[PDB]
Scaffold this active site. Sequence first.
Site, PDB file in Angstrom:
ATOM      1  N   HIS A   1       0.839  -1.102   0.150  1.00  0.00           N
ATOM      2  CA  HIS A   1       0.125  -0.010  -0.141  1.00  0.00           C
ATOM      3  C   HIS A   1       0.733   1.306  -0.050  1.00  0.00           C
ATOM      4  CE1 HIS A   1      -0.118   0.534   4.633  1.00  0.00           C
ATOM      5  NE2 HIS A   1      -0.095   1.621   4.146  1.00  0.00           N
TER       6      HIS A   1
ATOM      7  N   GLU B   1      19.258   6.855   8.062  1.00  0.00           N
ATOM      8  CA  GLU B   1      18.512   8.159   8.503  1.00  0.00           C
ATOM      9  C   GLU B   1      18.261   7.884   9.807  1.00  0.00           C
ATOM     10  OE1 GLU B   1      17.971  10.657   7.230  1.00  0.00           O
ATOM     11  OE2 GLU B   1      17.727  10.710   5.010  1.00  0.00           O
TER      12      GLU B   1
ATOM     13  N   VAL C   1      17.453  16.944   8.558  1.00  0.00           N
ATOM     14  CA  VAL C   1      18.578  17.314   8.201  1.00  0.00           C
ATOM     15  C   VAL C   1      19.890  16.140   7.744  1.00  0.00           C
ATOM     16  CG1 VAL C   1      20.597  18.145   9.871  1.00  0.00           C
ATOM     17  CG2 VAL C   1      18.554  18.700  10.402  1.00  0.00           C
TER      18      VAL C   1
ATOM     19  N   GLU D   1      24.023   9.038   5.679  1.00  0.00           N
ATOM     20  CA  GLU D   1      23.019   8.819   4.615  1.00  0.00           C
ATOM     21  C   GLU D   1      23.389   8.319   3.298  1.00  0.00           C
ATOM     22  OE1 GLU D   1      23.337  12.190   5.933  1.00  0.00           O
ATOM     23  OE2 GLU D   1      21.656  12.489   7.081  1.00  0.00           O
TER      24      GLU D   1
ATOM     25  N   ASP E   1      -0.299  -7.562   1.962  1.00  0.00           N
ATOM     26  CA  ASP E   1       0.350  -6.268   1.879  1.00  0.00           C
ATOM     27  C   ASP E   1       1.872  -6.275   1.935  1.00  0.00           C
ATOM     28  OD1 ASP E   1       0.419  -3.376   1.689  1.00  0.00           O
ATOM     29  OD2 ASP E   1      -0.311  -3.178   3.972  1.00  0.00           O
TER      30      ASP E   1
ATOM     31  N   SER F   1       3.885   2.814   7.944  1.00  0.00           N
ATOM     32  CA  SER F   1       3.335   1.582   6.851  1.00  0.00           C
ATOM     33  C   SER F   1       4.846   1.330   6.312  1.00  0.00           C
ATOM     34  CB  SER F   1       2.489   2.146   6.089  1.00  0.00           C
ATOM     35  OG  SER F   1       1.215   2.206   6.997  1.00  0.00           O
ATOM     36  N   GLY F   2       4.881   0.105   5.874  1.00  0.00           N
ATOM     37  CA  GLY F   2       6.189  -0.600   5.350  1.00  0.00           C
ATOM     38  C   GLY F   2       7.165  -0.621   6.234  1.00  0.00           C
TER      39      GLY F   2
END
Length: 223
Positions: free
Chosen positions: A40, A52, A57, A62, A84, A177-178
């Site tokens: 989704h 992260e 910032v 990163e 899902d 989510s995820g």
Amino acid sequence: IVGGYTCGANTVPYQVSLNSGYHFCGGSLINSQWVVSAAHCYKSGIQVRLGEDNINVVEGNEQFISASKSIVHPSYNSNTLNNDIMLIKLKSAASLNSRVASISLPTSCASAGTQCLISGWGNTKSSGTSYPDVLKCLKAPILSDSSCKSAYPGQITSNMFCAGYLEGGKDSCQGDSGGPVVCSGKLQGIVSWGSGCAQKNKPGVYTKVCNYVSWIKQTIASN
Ligand SMILES: COC(=O)C1CCN(C(=O)[C@H](Cc2cccc(C(=N)N)c2)NS(=O)(=O)c2ccc3ccccc3c2)CC1
Ligand SMILES: [Ca+2]
């Protein structure tokens, strides 16, 4: 994450932020070139952000890598949210190190009672909207299927499990989510859905990853 705590910079090295000019979903690095997330969360023009902490910032550590392809589970149902799960292939392999690492896929399903760590940059308020700059963590146990199905009659499939607190006040929320649900060093779940956030008797429902190990492996092997 509602009722959670600041994880600490890079303490959840497998946590990924899906970005499209802003953070919209989380994900989990399962290997140097593959990220697992929720179906989704599918969107074109996705940039995967690794290592992260403060998403607003640039602090160092990163790694911004574009997604080359997002493979949504063929049987994903957007109404029921069944199946899902989505696989994202990175355009380039991530530089794995101390602050950017992969999480292991489970070899068996986790049982009720098992304590897991849920994380993400989603909404921190049950009533309202407040998004954090830094990564939030929440430790929550996997609930029994009887309790899960009692909370969500006719909505729970064999590919879903509940985790959280029935008393409310602690739960994953929008934006999470995820994201990963790690139990004993294994990725057991993917933040999927819930009725509101941190509501009484309405725990979070997660995608049961152990039911997808063969699918993930086979798909990755063929892509
Ligand atoms: C199709 O994908 C979507 O549109 C997504 C919208 C957001 N979504 C939700 O479940 C939302 C917010 C949300 C997201 C992730 C975790 C929780 C939680 N309480 N643990 C809540 N909770 S909600 O009560 O607003 C909700 C619940 C179930 C839903 C099922 C289908 C579509 C939208 C839904 C919205 C998941 C589905
Ligand atoms: Ca940052």
